[PDB]
């Protein structure tokens, strides 16, 4: 809804909520001088 | 999008299509920040040099889409706009500074597997991720090429944020603090960019602290698409956050 939006914001029903990863999200995390 | 890929189903559930009533046409992208609010580029509604001035009545918003043109029966939600809000100091006159607008839906949308809001960054998230070299993701139904077209499905591309100085030196347009630029440098041998029809769409990042997706930018402008030595420019969302907060809190989410 704004600040870091809602409450459930940014958590995808078909990927994050299931603990599944999308084909290129790794490339992002690896750029943050390798995610989490 | 130039040099991107087809999105996967439910990859960007916050992605919205800005759609013209008549002629029916894809105006721009947009992103859902709650069940009632959508965020876009102001130049998608107002651009006087091109005789562009859209009112609530002229448009509709489509959410949960994949296909550019099919009507996705039992998947997509279409809404009407209660109200449009353009940044009072949006500069259409010279450089698209504050190229941002909020749209209030006539009625709230129910979330689902294909529909779900993105987060707005807080000062620290912003501080940690908005760095040269860090990659974000852009999405949209815009031009495949600079000039020739339209993709059949939603396209996605991951691009790095570039150093403010390299941004400045690539164009003769006056860059402000409310903008950032993104793309691969020419040696880097790897391309991709947003393009015309892509405005209003989100530049998002995934936090490595809490795993959530945040919208850091809005697709704003560029010169041609995917040209070497050039880059895409985005409205810097954290910078315009107060305004954002402010309209939502008067006009009530
Ligand atoms: C409305 C949007 O679809 C669009 C996005 C273009 C993205 N380009 C790239 N390569 N990432 N923006 C525009 O078309 C804006 C609105 C008005 C003119 N404009 C341009 O991008 C011009 N190409 C350059 C420019 C002109 C005047 C002021 C700012 C930029
Ligand atoms: C856009 O149209 C509205 C009426 O719908 C008008 O009030 C506004 O002044 C116009 N904008 C200009 C050309 O900046």
Q: What's the total number of domains in chain A?
A: 1
Beta-ladder partners of B217: B203, B236
Residue B63 near residue B83, CB atoms below 8 Å: no
Shortest CA gap A13–chain B (Å)? 5
Resolution in A: 2.4
Specify the pairing of strand B24-32 against strand B37-40. Answer: antiparallel
Q: Is B166 helix (H, G, I), strand (E, B) or coil?
A: helix
Shortest CA gap A31–chain B (Å)? 5
Assigned CATH class of B13-117+239-252: mainly beta
Identify the CATH number of the domain in which residue A34 sits.
4.10.140.10
Which entry of B199, B220, B226, B236 is annotated as an active-site residue? B199
Query: Can you give the residue range of the structural domain that contains A5?
Result: 1-36
Q: In sequence order, what are the residues at sequence separation of 6 or more whose Cβ sits closer than 8 angstroms to the Cβ of residue A22?
A: A15, B8, B11
User: Do B13-117+239-252 and B1-12+118-238 fall under one CATH topology?
Assistant: yes
Which of B77, B74, B87, B73 shows the shortest CA–CA distance to B19?
B77
- Record: contact A11-B9, CB cut-off 8 A: no
Q: Domain locations in chain B?
A: 1-12+118-238, 13-117+239-252
Q: List the single residue in A4, A25, A29 with the smallest CB-CB distance to B214.
A: A4
What's the rounded Cα separation, in Å, for the pair B159 and B190? 9
Assigned CATH class of B1-12+118-238: mainly beta
Q: Is the CB of B55 within 6 Å of ligand 2?
A: yes
Task: In chain B, count H helices and then E strands.
Answer: 3, 16
Give one DSSP letter per residue of B154-188, joined into a string.
-EEEEEEEE-HHHHHHT-SS---TTEEEE---STT
Q: Is B60 helix (H, G, I), strand (E, B) or coil?
A: strand
Ligand 1 atom closest to the Cα of residue B28 is 3
Q: In sequence order, what are the residues at sequence separation of 6 or more whose Cβ sits closer than 8 angstroms to the Cβ of residue B142?
A: B1, B29, B150, B155, B194, B195, B196, B197, B198, B199, B201
Task: Examine the residue annotation and report whether B193 is marked as an active-site residue of this protein.
Answer: no
């Amino acid at each position: 809804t704004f600040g870091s939006g809602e409450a459930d914001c940014g958590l995808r029903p078909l990927f994050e909520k299931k603990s599944l990863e999308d084909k290129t999200e790794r490339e992002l995390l690896e750029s943050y001088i390798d995610g989490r | 999008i130039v040099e991107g890929s087809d999105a996967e189903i439910g990859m960007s559930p916050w992605q919205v299509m800005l759609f013209r009533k008549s002629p029916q046409e894809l105006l721009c992208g947009a992103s859902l920040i709650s069940d009632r609010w959508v965020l876009t580029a102001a130049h998608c509604l107002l651009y006087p040099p091109w005789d562009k001035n859209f009112t609530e009545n002229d448009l509709l918003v489509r959410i949960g889409k994949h296909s550019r043109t099919r009507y996705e029966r039992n998947i997509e939600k279409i809404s009407m706009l209660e109200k449009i809000y353009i940044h009072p100091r949006y500069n259409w006159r010279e450089n698209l500074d504050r190229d941002i607008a909020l749209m209030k839906l006539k009625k709230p949308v129910a979330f689902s597997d294909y529909i779900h809001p993105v987060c707005l960054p807080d000062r620290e998230t912003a501080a940690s991720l908005l760095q040269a070299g860090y990659k974000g993701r852009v999405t949209g139904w815009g031009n495949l090429k600079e000039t020739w077209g339209q993709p059949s499905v939603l396209q996605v591309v991951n691009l790095p944020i570039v150093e403010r100085p390299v941004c400045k030196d690539s164009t003769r347009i006056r860059i402000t603090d409310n903008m950032f630029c993104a793309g691969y440098k020419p040696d880097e041998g790897k391309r991709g960019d947003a393009c015309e029809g892509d405005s209003g769409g989100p530049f998002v990042m995934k936090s490595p602290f809490n795993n959530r997706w945040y919208q850091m930018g809005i697709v704003s402008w560029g010169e041609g698409c995917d040209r070497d030595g050039k880059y895409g420019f985005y409205t810097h969302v954290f910078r315009l956050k107060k305004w954002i907060q402010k309209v939502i809190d008067q006009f009530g989410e």
